[model samples]
Target: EDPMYEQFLQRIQAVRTATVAKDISADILEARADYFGRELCRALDIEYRNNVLLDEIILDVYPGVNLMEYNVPHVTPDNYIWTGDMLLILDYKVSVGHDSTEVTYKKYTTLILPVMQEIGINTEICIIRANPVTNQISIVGEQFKRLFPTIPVELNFARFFELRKMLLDKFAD
Candidate 1:
């Protein structure tokens, strides 16, 4: 288990406070998200070291394809674990109130998965959100899916406890 969970909550509170105040600049907001993402990556690396060194990992899109234009989308996942069989891309989120609609999917589908497909790794994308005020963790992706059940995106949300159980069930042999 990672002890930085509390720190993550604190960072979320700080970010939310700035957002609510509406006084912070766009550059500062981007910086806040960057710090949050980096700390998240570090915390996750500590939690599970079975994967490689976790941080801002870049994927060169369609290395051999000439049609690919713009190979420079500064798209860094919150964290990722590339195992032998699967590539796990985790996009972390936190909200003082409610999360944005498919914020992770909207961001990742365009930014991350194209690279995954380009590299030929069976990918699993997860959007993890935790509310600092309530200390509640939930998957918000289903909210959008409930509105459109037939949607084909292979994405899911998992609460903190659910993640613990899943990891134990699958990885902690």
Candidate 2:
């Protein structure tokens, strides 16, 4: 004799995907690509493919970087330091605070974006400037639309948010 379904012992189990790495924080991992790419698949109650490697991304962001070894630039001569995983860009704000597109093009272009590009990751870097008096959002990386032809960045912030709400709206069972 057997068991329940024709003496079957088979069972369906709930599933989950493992994060790309065992060490590091999820926010640092920042699965923007996975989240964006899987929108459709997730909506249909389906699992989507994820290619994020958190440890790897941390390396990409801060190669040879460590949080402890760093000190304030004004206090120390060591400009570049690696403590744990946070490569403190002592001059990043000074360099890119105003116009970082150039820096992103010259320096980070080699490390960050190019890697994302080669791996087909739809990553977008946001640079925001808000004039307190004017209350305007002068944004860069608008060209992100041209890069990932699949995802649409057509609308401005307000419109994009509305679309987001609609997409996340409740659906009938």
Candidate 3:
């Protein structure tokens, strides 16, 4: 029934085979993470924007606010999805550690949440970590408490493991 499902599987398969070189640069890994994010959005039929600027969002929410007063650098979420009533902001990483998760949580809560509140759209933040070497995907963040209730079927842990299986199969042969 889902046409995109086959495309998603093929993408995973292509990545598995294409990444035969063990030594890869951080830039390449990050690019691959970006590619995965786009594929995931398409498979789920979710409309999303990549590298959304926080300044633009803040300006849209509070037109009168002066950004010159703030000393922060340009901050952008890796990907964001707006579903009419809610916004889901996501960050993709090659791997996730405690410090990485904590930093992402603090960044979103302190910088992004207030702006979304002004717009009256409930916001949730999620961190997606995909390890190319391990062929594993993990979803983590404070938003889990709220996300689990309205989670997409394709985004569930079980489905991620199934996707991982596709990657693992390449090496088994």
Clashes of each: 0, 5, 0
In candidate 2 the C-alpha lDDT for residue 41 amounts to 34
TM-score of 2: 0.25
Q: After superposition, how far is residue 154 of candidate 2 from its true place, in Å?
A: 23
Model 1 poorest ten-residue lDDT run: 46-55
Instruction: Give the RMSD in angstroms, all C-alphas superposed, for model 2.
Output: 17.2
Question: What TM-score does candidate 3 get on C-alpha atoms?
Answer: 0.53
Compose the digit string of candidate 2's lDDT tens values, residues 1-173. 22322111121111122242121123212222223334423432333433333344444554665534432112211112233422322111111134543553345434444444444345444332332223332434544223223432222223223322332342211
Clashing pairs in 1: none
Which has the greatest TM-score?
A: 3
Output the lDDT of residue 85, model 3: 57
lDDT (0-100) at residue 34 of candidate 3?
63
RMSD in Å for model 1 = 13.6
- What TM-score, to 2 decimals, does candidate 1 have? 0.45
Q: lDDT tens digits, residues 10-88, model 1? A: 4334544434323323323333334444544454442322222212343422235433443535655555555555656
lDDT of 3 by residue, 14-46 (tens): 654435522222333455566667656665566
Regions more than 4 Å wrong, model 3? 1-24, 55-73, 96-98, 141-173
